[PDB]
């Protein structure tokens, strides 16, 4: 599982005062699980959480994760990317 894990950094563009986090999540994880994780961490409703993933290979770009039944591997979420959460 060590090779399958990916270290993602959670950003907060709407709340720049917050610090940039860093969590090692499994590659075979659905965006439905990450939504609940963020809801339980930041105490924000699940439905009121728009996710997105920005690769360091594509600066100036943002992909929206609207589908919840898909995993992070399908969205080309490689190691070292950043996840921008909004609400």
């Amino acid at each position: 599982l060590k090779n399958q894990l990916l270290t993602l950094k959670i950003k907060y563009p709407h709340q720049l005062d917050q610090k940039v986090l860093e969590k090692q999540l499994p590659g075979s994880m659905t965006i439905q699980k990450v939504k609940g994780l963020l809801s339980r961490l930041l105490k924000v409703p699940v439905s009121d959480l728009l996710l997105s993933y920005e690769s360091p290979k594509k600066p100036g770009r943002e992909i929206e994760l609207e589908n919840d039944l898909k995993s992070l591997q399908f969205y080309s979420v490689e190691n070292g990317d950043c996840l921008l959460v909004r609400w």
Binding site: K23, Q32, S47
Partner: protein, 1107 residues
């Protein structure tokens, strides 16, 4: 109307100087420009007002000497796109044509590389521009290698280019060699250059054919745009060189087309343009054969040449040409020869060359061309010779005069309207309509020429179905287009190869007989009575359909004057209707592929005969018809599945019409001899092992009238209910059970309602037993090898419960009980919330029809006010129930009611945990929207959890509802719905849920069921207390399963849960658990995985399991 993208166009070109280096931006602009330009490909004349500035923004870029080659190529691409959109002929009149624009263009073209395929758009357009600069009225010597020599070399080098540039070299040399100073300098040189290329090159290589095509195009353009007296001396050498090449024998279409185009031009040069060397005698010899070519492009090009040559030659040769062209219509030719001859005749008549002497001949051929359809295999050919006949007829309006056409107008006008209605191709109909309009506008001597155009205009000969039942009657209304129009349909369409043409023709004759009953009963019916003896299979079906339709029409006509049907049809014709069955039974035509067609035709014939009250009652013909119907309803599996429903719905209708017409003794009664045998045989046929036998006999028994059910209704109902019951032998018998319910519903709708008569109609004595059979088939959920076939058995089980509930509502609504009505409502609600889309739509439609029914209102409607407010009348036709998005948001609201909670939730669980993706995605969103409103109220959440646990307990050890429910529970727990129950230790709800899950995951083998169980066991760790520890133990039991995939999935789920909920494990031991779940291969041998499992158990406080 006008160009509206110009506001965006001037900005695009403004960015041409910036997106010239980048590739992505250039491609986006080019694609964008192309999608902006292709919208006006039908309206090319709308861009002319913008052809001024739009060009100035392009040619001005290449003119600048301080620009790169990429920008020049990008601008030439847009220039070529604009030329393609509008047209080079109308676009090159805008290109610079000064004497100071020639040397610029020449050097520009000479700076190009023919090998660069990417810049092909620059070489194809540049050449064209040069042609413009060749239009100046100045001499090339005044400009001064010379310019003429350079232009000639460029043309010679481009005329053999395999790219599109070759075409650009055709219009160029056509204007450079045809000049005064250059037709006495370069013409002879380019002439010895073309002859050598034509004599050396062959049509066996790709480069030899390219050069030949280029040379032929150049010569054809030169002889076209060149002086007649200048290109006359060199008219024999080129012709001889072309004849010595043997182009007709070559296997190239473009080469032959160019050869014909050059031969016709050479022939036009010999004759003087007025309002004949021996060489001409050969030219014609090379054109006539062109009409008998294999390709249509060759004939279309030869027709123009022949038409242009007949007008520059005398009247003796002009008549000889027509006489020779008429020979193509002999009895030893194909359809291509006829097409070529028609094209040549049209081209000749368009110019006014045909004399009235050839009227008796030409008119004697066109009549054969408008109805050409010579079967050439499975399908027939002739649509080409028919489109040409339309153009030929269109030319008579300009050639002959009214005085010369009057003798043949009576036949031309009729043929035009006959071919402009019943034609199979819309193009032929439109061409015939245009020809008729042109003839009426010019000649104006056609019977009712104006009245026929107003009803059959260009926007009226579109729908083929409308032309057979609207325009046909309007044309037959007059006495000039009735008998021939009927004879055409009788001797052409009703004997056609396609079956749609033998059905449409019959339906058209049905209406045509109303305006001409005498002619259809004394002249047409005898011809359809003899056509049935035709060995042709398509001929017998058409004749039977016509005999049925005309008979029905005559019966309907006689019904007006309350007159008998024998008034129009004589007894001789009547004897044919009786012997038609004997003729088919003797020859044994009910076999092979045509047997089904013959049976279907005879069924419709018998139905139309019984619906007309014929004098056939008490004859052997009725017995023969009954035997045939029984044999058809006896042998159904032998018929193909692509036409079984038609035979099933037609035979039952014919039997009902016969059993509701001939099989009667007195009003309100029937012949007991037939009643004691038909019902007995049917009840002995409803127990047939073959499923198709019952599928056909149930509907036949149910379609019987009401007077034929008096006294024998209980037996029929019992026999139909015996089939609806499932047994060990009848497991996959869904089609039979469907027909069993359909026949019961039909019987209920026919008999109606009548108190004090259980054997005659439905009443309160047997309504309960009938409702019990309808409510029992809804629970059928068979899963055969084909799939979920039980759905079918449910479809007919829904409509049967609708039409019935309304029947009582229109007579004795008090019979409908409250419990039965509530059960039906709950079952319909459950059936209107299924993952399926086609079935859910019908379920919702039935529910809305049953709820909105208020005439009178139906009793026992649970929560009638809430249901009406949640499903208003406006949300019936506007809402699409087939789409989950436009259905689940409105169906999830039903959970608020108490009655609509258990069944609705059970039905929605299948959609919230099925296989389809979009349905689940929509159902989850619709359920979360409703849960958000009952999330704070603890009573609502408790009731929902109780109902879910009850549904779980009901469907235990069931792989139809257990897996969907377990999958939906995972999402329900991940979303955070049961958040109030987490603030209490030892929650009975979470205890019973875990207990039921342990039951459902007991020895679970399949991996699909194990995944949902593992997910639920990991999403249940949120509940503190004894449910947290015990649940954890289960995870351990899954970390050392019998498969490595299960262990890996369990480890991944445990790792995810450890990151989700942080209060489950202390921070002091979380590091060890995280490090043990990372560097551990859970897909290895169990000998090493057991140690890791024990280590994790010792850390998580879980007691050590025991084998």
């Amino acid at each position: 109307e006008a160009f509206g993208e110009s506001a965006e166009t001037r900005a695009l070109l403004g960015r041409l100087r910036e997106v010239h280096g980048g590739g992505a931006e250039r491609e986006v602009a080019l694609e964008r420009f192309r999608v902006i330009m292709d919208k006006y490909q039908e309206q090319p004349h709308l861009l002319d007002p913008h052809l001024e500035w739009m060009m100035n923004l392009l040619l001005d870029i290449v003119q600048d000497q301080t620009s790169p080659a990429s920008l020049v190529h990008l601008a030439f691409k847009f220039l070529y796109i604009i030329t393609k959109v509008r047209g080079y002929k109308t676009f090159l009149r805008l290109f610079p044509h000064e004497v100071a624009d020639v040397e610029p263009v020449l050097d520009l073209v000479t700076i190009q590389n023919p090998k660069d395929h990417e810049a092909w758009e620059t070489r194809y357009m540049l050449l064209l521009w040069l042609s413009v600069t060749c239009l100046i009225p100045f001499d090339f010597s005044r400009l001064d290698m010379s310019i003429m020599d350079r232009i000639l070399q460029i043309a010679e080098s481009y005329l053999i280019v395999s790219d599109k540039a070759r075409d650009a070299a055709a219009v160029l040399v056509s204007r450079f060699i045809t000049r005064p100073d250059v037709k006495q300098s370069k013409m002879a040189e380019f002439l010895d250059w073309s002859l050598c290329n034509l004599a050396r090159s062959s049509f066996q290589t790709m480069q030899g054919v390219i050069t030949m095509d280029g040379t032929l195009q150049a010569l054809a353009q030169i002889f076209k745009h060149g002086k007649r007296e200048d290109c006359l001396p060199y008219a024999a050498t080129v012709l001889r060189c072309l004849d010595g090449c043997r182009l007709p024998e070559s296997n190239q279409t473009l080469l032959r087309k160019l050869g014909v185009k050059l031969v016709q031009r050479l022939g036009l040069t010999f004759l003087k343009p007025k309002v004949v060397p021996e060489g001409v005698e050969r030219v014609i010899e090379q054109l006539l054969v062109g009409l008998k070519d294999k390709d249509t492009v060759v004939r279309w090009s030869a027709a123009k040449g022949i038409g242009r040559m007949a007008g520059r030659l005398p009247r003796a040769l002009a008549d000889d040409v027509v006489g020779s062209v008429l020979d193509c219509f002999s009895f030893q030719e194909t359809d291509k020869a006829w097409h070529g001859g028609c094209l040549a005749l049209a081209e000749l008549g368009r110019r006014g060359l045909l004399l009235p002497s050839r009227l008796v001949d030409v008119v004697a051929v066109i009549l054969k061309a408008l109805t050409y359809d010579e079967k050439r295999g499975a399908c027939s050919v002739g649509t080409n010779v028919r489109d040409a006949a339309c153009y030929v007829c269109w030319a008579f309006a300009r050639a002959y005069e009214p005085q010369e056409l009057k003798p043949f107008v009576t036949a031309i006008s009729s043929a035009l309207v006959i071919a402009a209605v019943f034609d199979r191709d819309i193009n032929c109909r439109r061409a015939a309509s245009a020809a008729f309009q042109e003839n009426v506008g010019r000649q104006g001597t056609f019977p009712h020429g104006i009245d026929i155009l107003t009803t059959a205009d260009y926007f009226a000969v579109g729908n083929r179905s409308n032309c057979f039942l609207v325009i046909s009657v309007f044309i037959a209304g007059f006495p000039e287009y009735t008998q021939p129009m009927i004879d055409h349909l009788v001797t052409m369409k009703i004997s056609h190869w396609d079956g749609v043409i033998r059905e449409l023709a019959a339906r058209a004759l049905h209406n045509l007989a109303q305006q001409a009953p005498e002619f259809s009963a004394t002249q047409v019916f005898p011809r359809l009575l003899s056509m049935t003896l035709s060995p042709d299979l398509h001929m017998r079906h058409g004749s039977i359909l016509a005999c049925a339709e005309v008979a029905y029409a005559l019966y309907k006509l006689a019904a007006q004057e309350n007159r008998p049907v024998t008034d129009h049809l004589d007894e001789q014709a009547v004897q044919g209707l009786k012997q038609i069955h004997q003729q088919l039974y003797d020859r044994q035509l009910y076999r092979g592929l045509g047997g089904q067609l013959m049976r279907q035709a005879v069924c419709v014939l018998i139905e139309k005969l019984s619906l007309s009250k014929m004098p056939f009652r008490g004859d052997t013909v009725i017995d023969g018809w009954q035997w045939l119907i029984n044999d058809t309803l006896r042998h159904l599996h032998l018929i193909s599945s692509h036409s079984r429903q038609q035979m099933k719905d037609a035979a039952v209708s014919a039997l009902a019409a016969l059993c509701s017409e001939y099989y009667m003794k007195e009003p309100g009664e029937a012949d007991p001899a037939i009643q004691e045998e038909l019902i007995t045989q049917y009840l002995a046929e409803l127990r047939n092992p073959e499923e198709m036998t019952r599928c056909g006999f149930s509907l036949a028994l149910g379609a019987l009238p009401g007077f034929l059910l008096k006294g024998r209704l209980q037996q029929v109902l019992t026999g139909l209910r015996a089939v609806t019951h499932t047994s060990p032998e009848d497991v996959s018998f869904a089609e039979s059970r469907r027909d069993g319910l359909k026949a019961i519903a039909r019987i209920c709708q026919t008999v109606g309602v009548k108190a004090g008569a259980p054997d005659e109609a439905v009443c309160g004595e047997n309504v309960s037993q009938i409702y019990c059979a309808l409510l029992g088939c809804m629970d059928d959920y068979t899963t055969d090898s084909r799939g979920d076939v039980g759905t079918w058995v449910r479809k007919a089980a829904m409509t049967s419960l609708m039409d019935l509930t309304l029947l009582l509502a229109r007579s004795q609504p008090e019979l409908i009980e409250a419990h039965t009505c509530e059960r039906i409502m709950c079952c319909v609600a459950q059936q209107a919330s299924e993952k399926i889309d086609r079935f859910r739509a019908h379920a919702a439609s039935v529910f809305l029809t049953l709820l909105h029914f208020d005439s009178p209102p139906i009793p026992h409607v649970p929560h009638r006010g809430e249901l009406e407010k949640l499903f208003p009348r406006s949300d019936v036709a506007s809402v699409n129930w087939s789409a989950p998005s436009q259905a689940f948001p409105r169906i999830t609201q039903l959970l608020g009611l108490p009655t609509y909670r258990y069944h609705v939730l059970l039905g929605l669980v299948v959609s919230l945990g099925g296989l389809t993706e979009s349905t689940i995605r929509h159902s989850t969103q619709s359920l979360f929207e409703y849960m958000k409103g009952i999330q704070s109220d603890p009573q609502a959440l408790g009731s929902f959890s109780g109902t879910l646990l009850q549904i779980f307990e009901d469907n235990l050890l069931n792989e139809r509802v257990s897996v969907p429910l377990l999958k939906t529970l995972d999402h329900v727990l991940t979303h955070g719905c049961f958040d109030i129950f987490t603030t209490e230790e030892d929650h009975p709800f979470a205890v019973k849920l875990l207990a039921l899950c342990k039951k459902e995951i007991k020895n679970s083998k399949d991996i699909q069921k194990l995944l949902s169980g593992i997910a639920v066991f990991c999403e249940m760790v949120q509940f503190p207390g004894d449910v947290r520890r015990q649940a954890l133990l289960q995870l351990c039991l899954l970390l050392c399963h019998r498969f490595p995939l299960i262990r890996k999935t369990t480890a991944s789920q445990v790792y995810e849960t450890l990151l989700t909920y942080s209060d489950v494990v202390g921070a002091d031991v979380l590091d060890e658990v995280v490090t043990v779940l990372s560097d551990t291969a859970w897909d290895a041998e169990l000998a090493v995985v057991r140690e890791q499992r024990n280590r994790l158990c010792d850390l998580l406080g879980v007691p050590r399991p025991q084998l």
